Paper text:
The periplasmic binding proteins (PBP) are a protein superfamily that serve as primary receptors for a diverse group of metabolic solutes in signaling, chemotaxis and metabolite transport systems in bacteria, eukaryotes and archaea. PBPs are comprised of two α/β domains connected by a flexible linker region that serves as a pivot point for the ligand induced hinge-bending motion that this protein superfamily is known for. Unlike other PBPs, the tmCBP binding site is bipartite, being composed of a typical PBP solvent excluded disaccharide binding site (subsite one) that is adjacent to an atypical large solvent filled cavity (subsite two) where three additional saccharide rings could be placed. The structure of tmCBP was solved in the presence of β(1,4) linked sugars, however the size of the tmCBP binding cavity and molecular modeling suggested additional glucan sugar linkages could be accommodated in both the disaccharide binding site and the solvent filled cavity. tmCBP is found in an operon that consists of an ABC transport system and an endoglucanase, the natural substrate of which has been predicted to be the algae-based storage polysaccharide laminarin.
The crystal structure of tmCBP complexed with LR2 was solved to a resolution of 2.05 Å by molecular replacement using the previously determined tmCBP structure. The final model consists of 582 amino acids, a larminaribiose molecule and 293 water molecules. The overall fold and conformation of the protein is similar to the structure of the cellobiose complexed protein (all atom RMSD= 0.4 Å). An extensive network of polar and non-polar amino acids and water molecules bind the LR2 ligand. A total of six tryptophan residues (Trp15, Trp380, Trp383, Trp426, Trp510 and Trp535) form van der Waals interactions with the two sugar rings. In total, ten hydrogen bonds can be formed with the first sugar ring. All but one hydrogen bond are directly formed with the protein, with the C6 hydroxyl being ligated by a single specifically bound water molecule, W20. For second sugar ring of the laminaribiose, only the C2 hydroxyl forms a direct hydrogen bond with the main chain carbonyl of Gly12, which also forms a hydrogen bond with the C2 hydroxyl of the first ring. The other six hydrogen bonds with the second ring are with water molecules. Unlike the other tmCBP structures that have been solved thus far, both the LR2 complex and the LR5 complex contain a pentagonal bipyrimidally-bound calcium ion.
Author numbering: 1 to 582
Write the structure that this text describes.
């Protein structure tokens, strides 16, 4: 039924059934945040710049008070202007509900205020001044249609609202839900999208995502032409074009094939007995067969993460790693953790864990390091294999771990509510504020929630440490790189001592394309957007760059910095402005 050449078929982004289209619900559906709701400004990792999207510009009143001016054209899909009240509303709702976009804003933002119809003002909290979070929450604030949400709240609990009626859906992005059922989710373009004159219309009229049960079935679909825009783990992906001559590609045409997405962790629930012991978590770190698993199970699509949680694939981040502490701690040339069952057993022995007759460790207090599961979603075959290789090694050191692979939604439920034992999951990636972002996401108790309550915002492992809080509250009280640095280095000491969870590998930014119906995909040859994976939070510009094969169109002129004749503002220009307002 869908017009094939006017539709982008997608894979690897939606796993399990659709849920809601409500970022305030416990779970929501792929596409909701990506395409339905846009921010004031879109961070562009590729260029280290910011696209003014819903906002046309900012002004620092002073260094702690930022005003953001909404484009006059910015307008919800129902014709109601997007206004400052929508910005205030979205954030206040998140604080009230304990869930929603911009979780944690109130920790570092003193107030968000609508100073006029199209003018929002954000003010940094000065007690725990943090310029990075001040900028992050404000520039990337996503408004929500207050006039919509208020009426829902009159009628039911917000957290229960589904938002699944297409004709009632009210969005800021260029797409909204068209149709769904147990086997597919489909979005349709908003042809009179407010952003049409500034940004153009995205070329696909439809985004469709057939719900595949597992990797092999999605891959088969991709091999046969049925997926244009894929975000999948695929084994030996190069074979698709090198051997099978299919019209498909990836970012790179040779080894890594994928750019990095972020840091994949073996998360260890700190609230469970045994797993609550830093010694046990440290022993787990030495028992991960990093290289063999990344080579065999991950196909070299990504490499071992540094234990500082800093993504050292990028030269600019390396200054934030205390290499002398890491090398001294782990005895390796760059300070990575070696796979070493001897050390793993040694750590366990020197903490007084002793194998019982069944081979499973018991601690000096009688805690058995056993039955635990390590879990990832069913059908995520790369992660499943990695789980099996990890679980085998843990068992041999007397930590009784078995794999379990439930439906994505079940897995997500246990992850977010902190009822898992071990999992592999994601965290965050390269960003203007990186390494801060990952410490904030993984280690900060203030973004967690009690066991049994959902968090998407951070610290699934329920790590609890007041010192980290204090260091995050201090790390960017001034813009002096050296101050960040020292806070980062101290957090690193704490990480090596507590091993809150294990940074294991750099996740791949899964991204594959077919040129059968759509061309001008972003790639190393055509590096127009650096987050093109269909599931990425920041995927949307990809849809403005591709063209129908039957009608090639040039790359949008708004891409590129201001000095290149685009509309994007360098991060350096924003800090220059911040500085200048001091
Ligand atoms: O590599 C693990 C699996 O990753 C899947 O993509 C994930 C997205 O759907 C998810 O929501 O975001 C994470 C961030 O790490 C992605 O890894 C692939 O679709 C699967 O094929 C793959 O096995
Ligand atoms: Ca969004």
């Amino acid at each position: 039924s869908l017009p094939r050449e006017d539709t982008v078929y997608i894979g690897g982004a939606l796993w399990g059934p659709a849920t809601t289209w409500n970022l305030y619900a416990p779970q929501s559906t792929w596409g909701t945040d990506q395409f339905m709701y846009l921010p004031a400004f879109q961070y562009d990792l590729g260029r280290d710049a910011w696209i003014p999207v819903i906002a046309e510009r900012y002004e620092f009143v002073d260094d702690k008070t930022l005003r953001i001016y909404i484009r006059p054209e910015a307008r919800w899909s129902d014709g109601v202007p997007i206004t400052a009240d929508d910005f205030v509303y979205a954030l206040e709702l998140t604080k009230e509900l304990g869930i929603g976009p911009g979780g944690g804003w109130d920790t570092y933002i003193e107030y968000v205020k609508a100073v006029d119809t199209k003018v929002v003002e954000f003010k940094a909290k000065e007690e725990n001044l943090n310029y990075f979070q001040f900028l992050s929450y404000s520039l990337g604030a996503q408004p929500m249609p207050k006039h919509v949400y208020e009426r829902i709240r009159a009628q039911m609990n917000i957290k229960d609202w589904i938002n699944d009626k297409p004709e009632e859906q009210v969005v800021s992005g260029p797409y909204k839900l068209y149709y769904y059922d147990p086997n597919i989710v489909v979005y349709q373009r908003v042809d009179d999208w407010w952003g049409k004159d500034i940004f153009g219309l995205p070329r696909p009229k439809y985004l469709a995502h057939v719900i595949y049960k597992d990797n092999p079935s999605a891959s088969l679909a991709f091999e046969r032409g049925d997926i244009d825009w894929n975000g999948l783990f695929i084994p030996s992906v190069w074979e698709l074009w090198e051997k099978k001559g299919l019209p498909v590609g990836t970012w790179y045409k040779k080894e890594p094939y994928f750019i990095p997405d972020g840091v994949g962790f073996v998360y260890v629930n700190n609230t469970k007995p045994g797993l609550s012991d830093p010694a046990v978590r440290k022993a787990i770190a030495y028992a991960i067969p990093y290289n063999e698993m990344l080579k065999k199970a991950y196909f070299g699509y990504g490499s071992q993460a540094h234990p500082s949680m800093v993504i050292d694939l990028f030269e600019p981040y390396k200054q934030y790693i205390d290499y002398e502490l890491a090398k001294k701690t782990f005895g390796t040339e760059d300070g990575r953790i070696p796979f070493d069952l001897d050390m793993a057993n040694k750590i366990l022995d020197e903490a007084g864990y002793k194998k019982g007759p069944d081979g499973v460790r018991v601690g000096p207090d009688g805690t058995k390091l056993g039955p635990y599961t390590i879990s990832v979603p069913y059908g995520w075959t790369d992660w499943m294999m990695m789980c099996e290789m990890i679980a085998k090694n843990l068992r041999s050191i007397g930590i009784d771990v078995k794999t379990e692979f439930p439906d994505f939604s079940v897995w997500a439920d246990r992850m977010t509510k902190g009822t898992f034992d071990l999992i592999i999951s994601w965290s965050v990636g390269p960003s203007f504020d990186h390494p801060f972002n990952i410490y904030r996401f993984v280690l900060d108790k203030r973004l967690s929630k009690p066991v049994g309550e959902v968090t998407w915002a951070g610290d699934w492992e329920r790590y609890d440490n007041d010192e980290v809080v204090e260091l995050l509250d201090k790390a960017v009280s001034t813009l002096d790189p050296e101050v960040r640095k020292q806070a980062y280095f101290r957090i690193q000491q704490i990480i090596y001592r507590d091993m809150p969870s294990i940074p294991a590998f750099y996740t791949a930014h899964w991204y594959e394309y077919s040129t059968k119906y759509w061309i001008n995909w972003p790639s190393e040859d055509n590096p127009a957007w650096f987050r093109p994976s269909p599931w990425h939070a920041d995927a949307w510009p990809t849809l403005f760059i591709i063209s129908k094969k039957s009608d090639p169109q040039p790359v949008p002129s708004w891409l590129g910095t201001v000095d290149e004749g685009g509309i994007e503002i360098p991060t350096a220009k924003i800090f220059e402005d911040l500085q200048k307002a001091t």
